């Protein structure tokens, strides 16, 4: 078991998601909540966030 | 459901502090995510640290 304070993957996911340019605030906060619900999903959620970011690129 | 508009404001405040490095900001962002009710203490701590690291 990995504790959240000792989980670099979780911490990096939160920080990266905070920076993504093409998400809206609702999406960002939903990701933050989903990470709280299950930190084991950090890799999946970060990948999902990046995919949505890229689909939502303005050009 | 604690990730709301106030949480957004605090995370933005942390990353805009100009003298913190990325590991520092990531750590404060984690602490805010871990306990959003501590935004006030954490934001003040981050600003203090920022000022300690000013050129």
Numbering used by the authors:
A (entry chain A): 0 to 58
B (entry chain B): 3 to 57
What is the paper's account of this structure, in its own sentences?
We adopted the Z domain of staphylococcal protein A and its affibody binder dimer complex as a model system. We next generated libraries at the interface of a weakly associating dimer (Z+ ZSPA-1) with micromolar affinity to determine if we could affinity-mature the interface by coevolution. To clarify these inter-residue co-variations discovered from the sequence data, we determined crystal structures of 10 coevolved pairs that spanned a range of cross-reactivities and orthogonalities (5 from LL1 and 5 from LL2). From the structures, we could verify clear compensatory changes between the residues showing the most significant covariations (13A-9B / 17A-31B) in both LL1 and LL2 library mutants.
Thus, the mutant LL1.c6 (LILFK/FIVF) can be a “bridging” intermediate to help explain the structural evolution of orthogonality through cross-reactivity. Comparing structures of LL1.c2 and LL1.c6 revealed that the single mutation Met32BPhe in LL1.c6 induced a noticeable geometric change by forming an enhanced hydrophobic cluster within the binding interface (Leu9A, Leu13A, Lys35A, Phe5B, Phe32B, and Trp35B). Due to the rotation of Trp35B and Trp35B-centered hydrophobic packing induced by Phe32B, the N-terminal end of helix 1 and C-terminal end of helix 2 of Z-A tilted 17° closer to Z-B. Furthermore, the compensatory relationship between position 17A and position 31B is clearly revealed from the structures of LL1.c1 and LL1.c2.
